[PDB]
Amino acid sequence: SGPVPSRARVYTDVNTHRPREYWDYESHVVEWGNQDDYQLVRKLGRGKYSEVFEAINITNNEKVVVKILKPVKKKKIKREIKILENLRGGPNIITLADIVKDPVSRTPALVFEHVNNTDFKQLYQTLTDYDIRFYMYEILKALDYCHSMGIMHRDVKPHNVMIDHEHRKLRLIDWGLAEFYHPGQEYNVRVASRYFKGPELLVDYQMYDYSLDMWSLGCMLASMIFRKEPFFHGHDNYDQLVRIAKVLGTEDLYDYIDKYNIELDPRFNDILGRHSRKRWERFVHSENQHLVSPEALDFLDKLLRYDHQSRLTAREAMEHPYFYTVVKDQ
Ligand SMILES: NC(=O)Cc1c[nH]c2ccc(Cl)cc12
Ligand SMILES: NC(=O)Cc1c[nH]c2ccc(Cl)cc12
Secondary structure: OOOOOOOOOOOOOOOOOOOHHHHOHHHOOOOOEOHHHEEEEEEEEEOOOEEEEEEEEOOOOOEEEEEEEOOOOHHHHHHHHHHHHHHOOOOOEOOEEEEEEOOOOOOEEEEEEOOOOOOOOOHHHHOOHHHHHHHHHHHHHHHHHHHHOOEEOOOOOHHHEEEEOOOOEEEEOOOOOOEEOOOOOOOOOOOOOHHHOOHHHHOOOOOOOOHHHHHHHHHHHHHHHHOOOOOOOOOOHHHHHHHHHHHHOHHHHHHHHHHOOOOOOHHHHHOOOOOOOOOHHHHOOOOOHHHOOHHHHHHHHHHOOOOHHHOOOHHHHHOOHHHHHHHHOO
């Protein structure tokens, strides 16, 4: 009658063996700080959910990044804070230094460790083949850690990867979309950016898991190695599935729909058509060849799969020979 259920292949039950307070974020009490510890120095950007500022901690002149939240429901803020606290200190995770509240306007504001420069405008531009491997391996460290801590990031894309190319350091940021994985739980599919949503989000399969972040990572890698950003350039959510299908083929699409007994929105019944699975060589040209290799295409093929169950996990991804040179170098 309904969709066939699903469980993560790894880290399935790590949140069950935790004390309830670790993932029951609705019950978390926020420990506020004094916002008068801090002065804003200048603005750095503004995303969909917050404005971002360079700022200074006046007691100990420490330099800091301040994210002033546009108003969201109290429970999503408790979620983000709890996740950031759980992950603090893990590899390549942004560190949450404080959390403050404007006395007048009552707006919450997270305070983070300084890092500078973003993946955009330096992504498909200045990085060598070895850079891409190195930085991808650093992202995998973050994803494997957070998954092993029971947490889905759900918004992996270049805008949320802060790289500081001088010091070869990387932080995975904006955890406001992240969730705890619980076996059997049905999640909201209206997450992540259009170009990075996995097939499970596009077909509205709610019992997804960590492997969602591995579809996004595969999207990021495809755009970097082919120098085509975004790789899947959908007009909207329904067309986004069409763009994937024109690359991955429809056969595996309808195979995935049947294995999980997914009801396909009748909207799709006309735009998907029939498409062969294309070979990756179709995307290689003179301008991107120096970043493409058999290793990279093989690795990519194993991230971009319809069946979320069959994607490389993060730990498996780090064992792929695309990263042999990186691993030996540390
Ligand atoms: N002393 C202040 O209240 C300055 C200020 C205005 N708006 C903010 C938002 C966050 C943080 Cl940490 C500081 C500020
Ligand atoms: N949220 C952003 O993408 C804006 C931004 C620019 N530069 C940063 C550095 C650190 C952090 Cl947390 C955020 C930013």
